[PDB]
Structure formats: structure tokens, C-alpha cells
Scaffold this active site. Structure first.
Site, mmCIF file in Angstrom:
data_model
loop_
_atom_site.group_PDB
_atom_site.id
_atom_site.type_symbol
_atom_site.label_atom_id
_atom_site.label_comp_id
_atom_site.label_asym_id
_atom_site.label_seq_id
_atom_site.Cartn_x
_atom_site.Cartn_y
_atom_site.Cartn_z
ATOM 1 N N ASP B 25 -34.598 44.956 13.466
ATOM 2 C CA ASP B 25 -34.159 44.253 14.664
ATOM 3 C C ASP B 25 -34.905 44.633 15.958
ATOM 4 O OD1 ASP B 25 -32.621 42.870 16.516
ATOM 5 O OD2 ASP B 25 -30.816 44.071 16.228
ATOM 6 N N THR B 26 -35.836 43.780 16.375
ATOM 7 C CA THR B 26 -36.580 44.018 17.614
ATOM 8 C C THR B 26 -35.668 43.906 18.835
ATOM 9 O OG1 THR B 26 -37.301 41.705 17.680
ATOM 10 C CG2 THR B 26 -38.750 43.293 16.578
ATOM 11 N N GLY B 27 -34.495 43.289 18.680
ATOM 12 C CA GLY B 27 -33.557 43.155 19.793
ATOM 13 C C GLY B 27 -32.622 44.332 19.986
HETATM 14 C C1 LIG Z 1 -28.676 40.110 16.760
HETATM 15 C C2 LIG Z 1 -28.967 41.587 16.673
HETATM 16 C C3 LIG Z 1 -27.672 42.359 16.627
HETATM 17 N N1 LIG Z 1 -27.131 42.882 17.911
HETATM 18 S S1 LIG Z 1 -25.576 42.170 18.237
HETATM 19 O O1 LIG Z 1 -25.226 42.469 19.616
HETATM 20 O O2 LIG Z 1 -24.698 42.589 17.155
HETATM 21 C C4 LIG Z 1 -25.584 40.384 18.099
HETATM 22 C C5 LIG Z 1 -26.114 39.617 19.120
HETATM 23 C C6 LIG Z 1 -26.113 38.238 18.995
HETATM 24 C C7 LIG Z 1 -25.584 37.644 17.863
HETATM 25 C C8 LIG Z 1 -25.047 38.419 16.852
HETATM 26 C C9 LIG Z 1 -25.043 39.799 16.966
HETATM 27 C C10 LIG Z 1 -27.999 43.030 19.127
HETATM 28 C C11 LIG Z 1 -28.468 44.483 19.245
HETATM 29 C C12 LIG Z 1 -27.321 45.414 19.668
HETATM 30 C C13 LIG Z 1 -27.709 46.876 19.608
HETATM 31 C C14 LIG Z 1 -27.794 47.532 18.383
HETATM 32 F F1 LIG Z 1 -27.537 46.878 17.243
HETATM 33 C C15 LIG Z 1 -28.159 48.863 18.290
HETATM 34 C C16 LIG Z 1 -28.443 49.583 19.428
HETATM 35 C C17 LIG Z 1 -28.350 48.955 20.660
HETATM 36 C C18 LIG Z 1 -27.994 47.617 20.751
HETATM 37 N N2 LIG Z 1 -27.940 47.054 22.055
HETATM 38 C C19 LIG Z 1 -29.076 46.890 22.806
HETATM 39 O O3 LIG Z 1 -30.205 47.173 22.430
HETATM 40 C C20 LIG Z 1 -28.791 46.354 24.185
HETATM 41 C C21 LIG Z 1 -29.420 44.969 24.373
HETATM 42 C C22 LIG Z 1 -28.590 43.864 23.802
HETATM 43 C C23 LIG Z 1 -29.217 42.932 22.995
HETATM 44 C C24 LIG Z 1 -28.491 41.880 22.480
HETATM 45 C C25 LIG Z 1 -27.152 41.759 22.778
HETATM 46 F F2 LIG Z 1 -26.458 40.725 22.266
HETATM 47 C C26 LIG Z 1 -26.510 42.675 23.586
HETATM 48 C C27 LIG Z 1 -27.237 43.730 24.089
HETATM 49 C C28 LIG Z 1 -29.699 44.590 25.810
HETATM 50 C C29 LIG Z 1 -30.939 44.064 26.123
HETATM 51 C C30 LIG Z 1 -31.219 43.682 27.423
HETATM 52 C C31 LIG Z 1 -30.247 43.826 28.394
HETATM 53 F F3 LIG Z 1 -30.506 43.463 29.663
HETATM 54 C C32 LIG Z 1 -29.001 44.341 28.098
HETATM 55 C C33 LIG Z 1 -28.728 44.715 26.794
HETATM 56 C C34 LIG Z 1 -29.203 42.109 19.158
HETATM 57 N N3 LIG Z 1 -29.819 42.050 17.805
#
Ligand SMILES: C[C@@H]1CN(S(=O)(=O)c2ccccc2)[C@@H](CCc2c(F)cccc2NC(=O)CC(c2ccc(F)cc2)c2ccc(F)cc2)CN1
Ligand SMILES: [Cl-]
Ligand SMILES: [Cl-]
Ligand SMILES: [Cl-]
Lengths: 99, 99
Positions: B25-27
Site C-alpha cells: 500500500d503506497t497510501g
Molecule cells: C486504502 C488503503 C487502506 N487505508 S484505509 O484508511 O483503511 C482505507 C482508505 C480508503 C478506503 C478503504 C480503506 C489507508 C492507509 C491508512 C494507514 C495505514 F493502513 C497504515 C499506517 C498509516 C495509515 N494512514 C496514513 O498513512 C495516513 C494517510 C491516510 C491515507 C488514506 C486515508 F484514507 C486516511 C489517511 C494520510 C495521508 C495524507 C494526509 F494528509 C492525511 C493522512 C489508505 N490505503
């Protein structure tokens, strides 16, 4: 381009005539954008993961320009903390992970 | 390898001698895995997701193999829906986004 992952892969996107910053997220199935108006019909959807679920509006056949690459697909709109470009649009611009 | 995004980028990881499935996950800034036993002391950490913030356990200098590539770094343990390999470890294995 080649984007390293030392920092968040944030890029400028163009959607509904607006310029926004969005994160390229390989872990996301769908693209989710902060509250904005989009044309056409929509249907409600719930998406979730870390921290639980949020309600979003699903808009289909929306054009987005990502780093000069045009793509069309479904865009979810809702109270996301960050604009996310998910796999549904990353595939269209030919984005791959490499190591 | 080169991984396309038509499907979820799921890979096999090895941690604590056990094979598990994880999403590249790059996000995600950090790596978070489902409940398991890890050695040493842990520190408190809050991570923000789509639905809000959750508390996790932060373990440092953990040995983990990702798609056959060795990494040693921070691993968070908590209530995540899927095991996630975040940028802290994708950088260690030399992962980049390309289009
Ligand atoms: C889809 C996957 C799963 N998750 S999720 O929320 O479950 C999800 C999102 C959509 C749809 C389904 C699931 C996200 C990573 C979450 C994550 C981890 F897993 C492990 C370690 C850290 C983190 N959080 C970040 O790094 C913060 C980050 C972030 C990115 C996406 C967010 F939605 C919320 C927050 C951020 C970036 C810029 C900013 F200004 C403020 C915050 C995104 N990638
Ligand atoms: Cl789509
Ligand atoms: Cl392809
Ligand atoms: Cl680390």
C-alpha cells in the site's frame, strides 16, 4: 515518471474543472475525493477500513487528469481525510509497482 | 518484479516464522498487521484511516520478508482489516510507482 516512496506520493489532479492534490494509493480499490459537486446521477455507498466506515456518493464515468494522463472511472465523494487515487484509475494511467 | 494493479497487490510476507498475506500500500505511511505476538517492548501509536484514528502497538527493528525481500523495521499491530505493507518497508525493498 518514477515515484519513490520516501514521502507520500501526492500528485496534482484535475477533476470537475478543479485542481486538487491526491495520493496515489495502491492499497485502495476505489478513488475517493473530498466533498465537491460532480455532474450526473449518484448512488450512496459505504466504504471502510482503518477507523471504520464513511458514507460516500458514487458517481460513474467521471474524467480525471492525473499527471497529464486522462482516465475515466467511478469516483466516490465524501468526508475522506485525503483525496485518494485508487486502483480503478491507477490501472488506466498504466501505473505499476516495481522492485 | 513489476506488479500491475488490475487486482489487489497481495503478496506473501514472512514474520515470526509464519507466512501471511499482505497488501502493498503506497497510501500507507507505515506497516500495520493483524493481532500476533512480536518480541520486545512496544510503544503507543495512533494511525489515521478513512473512518478515523485507531490505537496500535509499535514494535521496532522487526525482521520481515516481503515477496522474498528481506526488511528490518517498524511494524504496527492492531485492528486493521488486512495486513498492510506501508512506505516504511516498501522503501527498504526498493519499491517505486511507475507510469
Ligand atoms: C486504502 C488503503 C487502506 N487505508 S484505509 O484508511 O483503511 C482505507 C482508505 C480508503 C478506503 C478503504 C480503506 C489507508 C492507509 C491508512 C494507514 C495505514 F493502513 C497504515 C499506517 C498509516 C495509515 N494512514 C496514513 O498513512 C495516513 C494517510 C491516510 C491515507 C488514506 C486515508 F484514507 C486516511 C489517511 C494520510 C495521508 C495524507 C494526509 F494528509 C492525511 C493522512 C489508505 N490505503
Ligand atoms: Cl471504475
Ligand atoms: Cl496493463
Ligand atoms: Cl521502519
Amino acid at each position: 515518471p518514477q515515484i519513490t516512496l520516501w514521502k507520500r506520493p501526492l500528485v496534482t489532479i484535475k477533476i470537475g474543472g478543479q485542481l486538487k492534490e491526491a495520493l496515489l494509493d495502491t492499497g485502495a480499490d476505489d478513488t475517493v475525493i473530498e466533498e465537491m459537486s460532480l455532474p450526473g446521477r449518484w448512488k450512496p455507498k459505504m466504504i471502510g477500513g482503518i477507523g471504520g466506515f464513511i458514507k460516500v456518493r458514487q458517481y460513474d464515468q467521471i474524467i480525471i487528469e492525473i499527471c497529464g494522463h486522462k482516465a475515466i472511472g467511478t469516483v466516490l465523494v465524501g468526508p475522506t481525510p485525503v483525496n485518494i487515487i485508487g486502483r480503478n484509475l491507477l490501472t488506466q494511467i498504466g501505473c505499476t509497482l516495481n522492485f
